[PDB]
Design a protein around this ligand. Structure first.
Ligand SMILES: Cn1ncc(Cl)c1C(=O)N1CCCCC1
Ligand SMILES: Cn1ncc(Cl)c1C(=O)N1CCCCC1
Length: 282
C-alpha cells in the first residue's frame, strides 16, 4: 500500500502495536559473540543491545578492537551510517578513535546528557574554547572551535588532532536538544528541519566517511533518524515514489543492527516524518 493512506488505515484501526510486533518477529537474528566476551562488559551500556559480529566497527588496535557500534550500508539509497551507543566514561577515547579512523565529518546526537534524572551518556566534548580535552588512551586532542545555539538544536565546530601524527580535522557536532523525556514529538517539523541541516553540511555525503549517530542505546531515536533520511532519498531517486515501503526499509536496516525503532510510537512518528517530509521536498 501507499504510505499516507496505510497510515490513516492503521490510525483508524488502532493497530500500531500489532504492526510493530510483526516487524519484531520478522527481524534478523545474527551472532554478537565479540560483544558478549567478559573483557568487554564495561564497554556496553545495556546488556540487551549489542552490535552483530558481521557489521560491527573495529578499532585499529591489536589489544582490544571492540566498540558498541554498527555499519548500516544502504545499497540502493547509496548512504551509509554508523549507529552507536552514547559513550561511557571508559569509552570516550574509543569513540573519538572511531571518528578519526572512519574519516567521519559529522556526529549526530539525539539525547541530552541527563534525562529523567539519570545520566544517558558521558560529557564527551568540551564546553569551553579554552578548556580542551585530551584522551590519553587513544592519543587524541579535542577542542571546541565555535557553538551556535538554536531553539531546537545546537551545532558545534570541533577540532580533532591525532597527537601521534599532528594531523588535524574539523568535525561538526549536530545536537538535537528537544526530544521529550517521554514519548515522541507531537510534530515532526523540528526533527525534519534538523535532518536537513545535517544534510546541508556535507556530513552525509560520499566524499566523507559515514556519519556517526547516537542516542543512549543507539537504536531508538537513532533508528528514526536514518530510517527517515533513507526513505526520503529513495522517494527522490525512484520513478514511482509511492513504491517506497517503510516497513521493508526498516527490516533491511535491522540486518545491520538489532532493535532499530524501540516502540510503536517511534514507528508511527517515523511514518509521520517521511509523509510530511515528502511534501516539502517538492
Ligand atoms: C575531561 N576528560 N579527559 C578525559 C576524559 Cl575521558 C574526559 C571525560 O570526558 N571524562 C568523563 C568520563 C570519565 C572521566 C573523564
Ligand atoms: C515537513 N515540514 N517541513 C517544514 C515543516 Cl515546518 C514541516 C511540517 O512538519 N509541517 C507540518 C505539515 C505541513 C508542513 C509543515
Amino acid at each position: 500500500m501507499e504510505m499516507e493512506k496505510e497510515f490513516e488505515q492503521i490510525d483508524k484501526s488502532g493497530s500500531w502495536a500489532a504492526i510493530y510486533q510483526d516487524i519484531r518477529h520478522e527481524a534478523s537474528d545474527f551472532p554478537s559473540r565479540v560483544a558478549k566476551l567478559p573483557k568487554n562488559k564495561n564497554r556496553n551500556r545495556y546488556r540487551d543491545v549489542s552490535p552483530f559480529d558481521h557489521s560491527r566497527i573495529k578499532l585499529h588496535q591489536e589489544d582490544n578492537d571492540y566498540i558498541n557500534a554498527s555499519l548500516i550500508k544502504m545499497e540502493e539509497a547509496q548512504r551509509s551510517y554508523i549507529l552507536t551507543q552514547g559513550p561511557l566514561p571508559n569509552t570516550v577515547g574509543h569513540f573519538w578513535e572511531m571518528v578519526w579512523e572512519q574519516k567521519s565529518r559529522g556526529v549526530v546526537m539525539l539525547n541530552r546528557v541527563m534525562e529523567k534524572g539519570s545520566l544517558k551518556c558521558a560529557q564527551y566534548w568540551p564546553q569551553k574554547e579554552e578548556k580542551e580535552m585530551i584522551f590519553e588512551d587513544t592519543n587524541l586532542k579535542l577542542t571546541l572551535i565555535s557553538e551556535d545555539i538554536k531553539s531546537y538544536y545546537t551545532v558545534r565546530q570541533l577540532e580533532l588532532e591525532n597527537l601521534t601524527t599532528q594531523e588535524t580535522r574539523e568535525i561538526l557536532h549536530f545536537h538535537y536538544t528537544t526530544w521529550p523525556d517521554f514519548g515522541v514529538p507531537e510534530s515532526p517539523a523540528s526533527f525534519l528541519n534538523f535532518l536537513f541541516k545535517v544534510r546541508e553540511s556535507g556530513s552525509l555525503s560520499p566524499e566523507h566517511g559515514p556519519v556517526v549517530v547516537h542516542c543512549s542505546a543507539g537504536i531508538g531515536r537513532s533508528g528514526t533518524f536514518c530510517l527517515a533520511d533513507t526513505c526520503l532519498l529513495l522517494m527522490d531517486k525512484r520513478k514511482d515514489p509511492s513504491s517506497v515501503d517503510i516497513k521493508k526499509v526498516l527490516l533491511e536496516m535491522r540486518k545491520f543492527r538489532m532493535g532499530l525503532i524501540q516502540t510503536a510510537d517511534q514507528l508511527r512518528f517515523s511514518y509521520l516524518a517521511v509523509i510530511e517530509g515528502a511534501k516539502f521536498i517538492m
